[PDB]
CSV table of C-alpha atoms in Angstrom, one decimal:
chain,number,residue,atom,x,y,z
A,1,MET,CA,74.9,101.8,113.1
A,2,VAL,CA,74.7,98.0,112.9
A,3,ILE,CA,76.2,96.5,109.7
A,4,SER,CA,75.1,93.0,108.6
A,5,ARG,CA,76.4,90.6,105.9
A,6,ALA,CA,74.3,90.6,102.7
A,7,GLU,CA,73.4,94.3,103.1
A,8,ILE,CA,73.8,96.7,100.2
A,9,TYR,CA,75.2,100.2,101.0
A,10,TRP,CA,76.5,103.1,98.9
A,11,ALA,CA,80.2,103.9,99.3
A,12,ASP,CA,82.7,106.4,97.8
A,13,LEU,CA,85.5,104.1,96.6
A,14,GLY,CA,87.7,107.1,95.6
A,15,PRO,CA,89.6,108.1,92.5
A,16,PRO,CA,90.1,105.7,89.6
A,17,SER,CA,93.5,104.0,89.3
A,18,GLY,CA,93.7,101.6,86.4
A,19,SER,CA,91.2,98.8,87.0
A,20,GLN,CA,91.0,98.9,90.8
A,21,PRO,CA,87.6,99.6,92.4
A,22,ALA,CA,86.6,103.2,92.3
A,23,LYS,CA,83.9,105.9,92.3
A,24,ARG,CA,80.7,106.1,94.3
A,25,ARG,CA,78.8,102.8,93.9
A,26,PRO,CA,76.7,100.2,95.7
A,27,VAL,CA,78.6,97.6,97.6
A,28,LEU,CA,77.6,94.3,99.1
A,29,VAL,CA,78.8,93.5,102.6
A,30,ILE,CA,80.5,90.1,102.6
A,31,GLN,CA,82.2,90.3,106.0
A,32,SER,CA,80.7,88.0,108.6
A,33,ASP,CA,78.5,89.4,111.3
A,34,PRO,CA,80.8,88.6,114.3
A,35,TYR,CA,83.4,90.9,112.7
A,36,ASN,CA,80.8,93.4,111.7
A,37,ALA,CA,79.6,93.6,115.4
A,38,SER,CA,83.1,93.8,116.7
A,39,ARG,CA,85.4,96.8,117.3
A,40,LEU,CA,87.0,96.2,113.9
A,41,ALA,CA,86.9,99.6,112.2
A,42,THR,CA,86.5,98.1,108.7
A,43,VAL,CA,84.1,96.0,106.7
A,44,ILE,CA,84.8,93.9,103.6
A,45,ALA,CA,82.4,94.3,100.6
A,46,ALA,CA,82.0,93.3,97.0
A,47,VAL,CA,81.6,96.0,94.3
A,48,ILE,CA,78.2,96.2,92.5
A,49,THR,CA,78.0,97.6,89.0
A,50,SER,CA,75.2,98.3,86.5
A,51,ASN,CA,77.5,97.0,83.7
A,52,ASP,CA,75.5,94.1,82.3
A,53,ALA,CA,78.7,92.8,80.6
A,54,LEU,CA,80.2,91.6,84.0
A,55,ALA,CA,77.2,89.4,84.6
A,56,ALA,CA,78.8,86.9,82.2
A,57,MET,CA,82.0,86.6,84.3
A,58,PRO,CA,82.1,83.3,86.1
A,59,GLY,CA,81.4,83.8,89.8
A,60,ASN,CA,79.5,87.1,89.4
A,61,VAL,CA,75.9,87.3,90.5
A,62,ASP,CA,72.9,89.0,88.8
A,63,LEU,CA,70.9,91.5,91.0
A,64,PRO,CA,67.5,92.3,89.5
A,65,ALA,CA,66.4,95.9,90.4
A,66,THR,CA,63.1,94.4,91.6
A,67,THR,CA,65.0,92.4,94.2
A,68,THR,CA,67.4,95.0,95.5
A,69,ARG,CA,65.4,98.3,95.1
A,70,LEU,CA,68.5,99.7,93.4
A,71,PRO,CA,67.7,101.9,90.4
A,72,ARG,CA,69.0,99.4,87.8
A,73,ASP,CA,69.7,95.8,87.1
A,74,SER,CA,73.1,95.2,88.6
A,75,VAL,CA,75.8,92.7,89.1
A,76,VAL,CA,77.9,91.6,92.1
A,77,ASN,CA,81.5,91.6,90.9
A,78,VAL,CA,83.2,89.1,93.1
A,79,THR,CA,86.6,89.9,91.5
A,80,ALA,CA,86.3,93.4,93.0
A,81,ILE,CA,86.6,93.3,96.8
A,82,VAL,CA,87.2,96.4,99.0
A,83,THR,CA,87.9,97.0,102.6
A,84,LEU,CA,86.1,100.1,103.8
A,85,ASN,CA,85.8,102.0,107.1
A,86,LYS,CA,82.5,101.2,108.6
A,87,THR,CA,81.7,104.9,108.6
A,88,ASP,CA,82.1,105.0,104.8
A,89,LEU,CA,78.9,103.1,104.3
A,90,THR,CA,76.0,105.4,103.5
A,91,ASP,CA,72.4,105.2,102.2
A,92,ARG,CA,71.6,101.6,103.2
A,93,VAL,CA,69.6,100.0,100.4
A,94,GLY,CA,68.4,96.6,101.9
A,95,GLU,CA,69.5,93.1,102.4
A,96,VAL,CA,70.0,90.6,99.5
A,97,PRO,CA,67.9,87.4,99.9
A,98,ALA,CA,69.5,84.2,101.1
A,99,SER,CA,69.2,82.4,97.8
A,100,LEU,CA,71.1,85.1,96.0
A,101,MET,CA,73.7,85.4,98.8
A,102,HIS,CA,74.3,81.7,98.4
A,103,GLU,CA,75.4,82.4,94.8
A,104,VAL,CA,77.6,85.2,96.0
A,105,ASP,CA,79.2,82.8,98.5
A,106,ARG,CA,79.9,80.2,95.8
A,107,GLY,CA,81.4,82.9,93.6
A,108,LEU,CA,83.7,84.2,96.3
A,109,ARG,CA,85.0,80.7,97.0
A,110,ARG,CA,85.7,80.3,93.3
A,111,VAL,CA,87.6,83.6,93.0
A,112,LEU,CA,89.5,83.1,96.2
A,113,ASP,CA,90.0,79.3,95.9
A,114,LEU,CA,88.3,78.7,99.3
B,1,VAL,CA,103.0,85.7,86.2
B,2,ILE,CA,101.2,86.1,89.5
B,3,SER,CA,100.3,83.1,91.6
B,4,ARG,CA,98.2,82.5,94.7
B,5,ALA,CA,100.2,82.4,98.0
B,6,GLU,CA,102.9,84.7,96.6
B,7,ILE,CA,103.9,87.8,98.6
B,8,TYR,CA,104.6,91.0,96.8
B,9,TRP,CA,105.4,94.6,97.8
B,10,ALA,CA,102.6,96.8,96.6
B,11,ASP,CA,101.4,100.3,96.4
B,12,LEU,CA,97.9,100.4,97.9
B,13,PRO,CA,97.5,105.8,93.7
B,14,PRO,CA,99.8,108.6,95.0
B,15,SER,CA,98.3,111.8,96.3
B,16,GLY,CA,100.1,115.0,95.5
B,17,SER,CA,103.4,115.4,97.4
B,18,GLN,CA,103.4,112.1,99.2
B,19,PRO,CA,103.5,108.4,98.1
B,20,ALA,CA,100.7,105.8,98.3
B,21,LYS,CA,101.1,103.5,101.2
B,22,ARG,CA,103.3,100.5,100.6
B,23,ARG,CA,102.8,97.1,102.2
B,24,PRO,CA,103.6,93.5,101.5
B,25,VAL,CA,100.5,91.7,100.3
B,26,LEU,CA,99.6,88.1,100.0
B,27,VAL,CA,97.8,87.0,96.8
B,28,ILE,CA,94.6,85.2,97.6
B,29,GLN,CA,92.9,85.3,94.2
B,30,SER,CA,92.8,81.9,92.5
B,31,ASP,CA,95.3,81.1,89.7
B,32,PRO,CA,92.7,80.7,86.9
B,33,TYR,CA,91.8,84.3,87.5
B,34,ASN,CA,95.4,85.3,88.0
B,35,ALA,CA,96.3,83.8,84.6
B,36,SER,CA,93.3,85.5,82.8
B,37,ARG,CA,93.2,88.9,81.2
B,38,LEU,CA,91.6,90.3,84.4
B,39,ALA,CA,93.6,93.4,85.1
B,40,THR,CA,93.4,93.0,88.9
B,41,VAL,CA,94.3,90.6,91.7
B,42,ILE,CA,92.9,90.3,95.2
B,43,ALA,CA,95.3,90.2,98.1
B,44,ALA,CA,95.4,90.3,101.9
B,45,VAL,CA,97.6,93.0,103.5
B,46,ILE,CA,100.6,91.9,105.6
B,47,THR,CA,101.4,94.0,108.7
B,48,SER,CA,103.9,93.8,111.6
B,49,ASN,CA,103.3,91.3,114.4
B,50,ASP,CA,102.0,93.9,116.9
B,51,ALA,CA,99.3,94.3,119.6
B,52,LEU,CA,97.5,96.3,117.0
B,53,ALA,CA,97.8,93.3,114.6
B,54,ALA,CA,95.7,91.1,116.8
B,55,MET,CA,92.5,89.8,115.3
B,56,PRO,CA,91.0,86.3,115.3
B,57,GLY,CA,91.8,84.6,112.0
B,58,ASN,CA,95.1,86.5,111.3
B,59,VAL,CA,98.1,84.3,110.6
B,60,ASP,CA,101.6,84.7,111.9
B,61,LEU,CA,104.3,84.6,109.2
B,62,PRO,CA,107.8,84.0,110.5
B,63,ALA,CA,110.5,86.1,108.9
B,64,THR,CA,112.6,83.0,108.3
B,65,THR,CA,109.7,81.7,106.1
B,66,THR,CA,108.7,84.7,104.1
B,67,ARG,CA,112.1,86.4,103.7
B,68,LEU,CA,110.5,89.7,104.8
B,69,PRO,CA,113.0,91.5,107.1
B,70,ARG,CA,110.9,90.9,110.3
B,71,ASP,CA,108.1,88.8,111.7
B,72,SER,CA,104.8,89.8,110.2
B,73,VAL,CA,101.1,88.8,110.1
B,74,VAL,CA,98.6,88.2,107.4
B,75,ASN,CA,95.6,90.4,108.1
B,76,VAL,CA,92.6,88.5,106.8
B,77,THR,CA,90.4,91.5,107.6
B,78,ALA,CA,92.3,93.7,105.2
B,79,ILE,CA,91.4,92.6,101.7
B,80,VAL,CA,92.4,94.7,98.7
B,81,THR,CA,91.9,94.5,94.9
B,82,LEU,CA,95.0,95.8,93.2
B,83,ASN,CA,96.2,96.4,89.6
B,84,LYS,CA,98.4,93.5,88.6
B,85,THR,CA,100.9,96.2,87.6
B,86,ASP,CA,101.0,97.5,91.2
B,87,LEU,CA,102.6,94.4,92.4
B,88,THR,CA,106.3,95.2,92.1
B,89,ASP,CA,108.8,93.0,93.9
B,90,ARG,CA,108.0,89.4,94.5
B,91,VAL,CA,109.1,88.4,97.9
B,92,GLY,CA,108.3,84.7,97.9
B,93,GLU,CA,105.6,82.0,98.4
B,94,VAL,CA,103.8,81.1,101.7
B,95,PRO,CA,104.1,77.4,102.2
B,96,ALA,CA,100.9,75.2,101.8
B,97,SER,CA,100.5,74.5,105.5
B,98,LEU,CA,100.5,78.2,106.4
B,99,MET,CA,98.3,79.0,103.4
B,100,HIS,CA,95.8,76.5,104.8
B,101,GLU,CA,95.7,78.7,107.9
B,102,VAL,CA,95.1,81.8,105.8
B,103,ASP,CA,92.3,80.0,103.9
B,104,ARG,CA,90.7,79.2,107.2
B,105,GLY,CA,91.0,82.8,108.4
B,106,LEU,CA,89.5,84.0,105.1
B,107,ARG,CA,86.6,81.6,105.3
B,108,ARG,CA,85.9,82.8,108.9
B,109,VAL,CA,86.0,86.6,108.1
B,110,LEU,CA,83.8,86.1,105.0
B,111,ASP,CA,81.4,83.5,106.4
B,112,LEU,CA,82.3,81.0,103.7
């Protein structure tokens, strides 16, 4: 399938290990489209959580259920970045609007000093 | 204390009878987050300079620079979020000029 930046998918992030990303959850594709369309086997994504507490962390981005069509109000956790096999992405949810992705972009530059 | 541009050896969560993978990783998370109570750090995986290492945006690290045993490459397409406690041996710091190349590679791969 074709994977595009700003898309939300579900992925199994695997067993917990301390605070690292884990478990089955929605993820937001943040890898750029030329890499997504390339032979690169992987895609980079930010973890999404329904934990309303993380919305208060600087850089994180609120995702209203009415926007995403996810079951619950959720948050993009820009401090939680994973690299997944493209084939790991399942149950495509939709694409986050440009205005919200711009906030994600600003958050990623903040957390990565870019 | 973990700082951006530092290289560590890291475990990427063992599985039964055999060890988690171990790779050098380059810290790319910003220092205000590194210094915080945040339990994790974001890093790019370092691999050997190989044909299989080839990808636009990746950055060559000379062994003489990093103090890794051999020439290696920062893979800007391989971004991991690790427990701060899983960074074990500090190897050194990538100089600013080379880190600027890594920044450029990251901005490219993430469309930033």
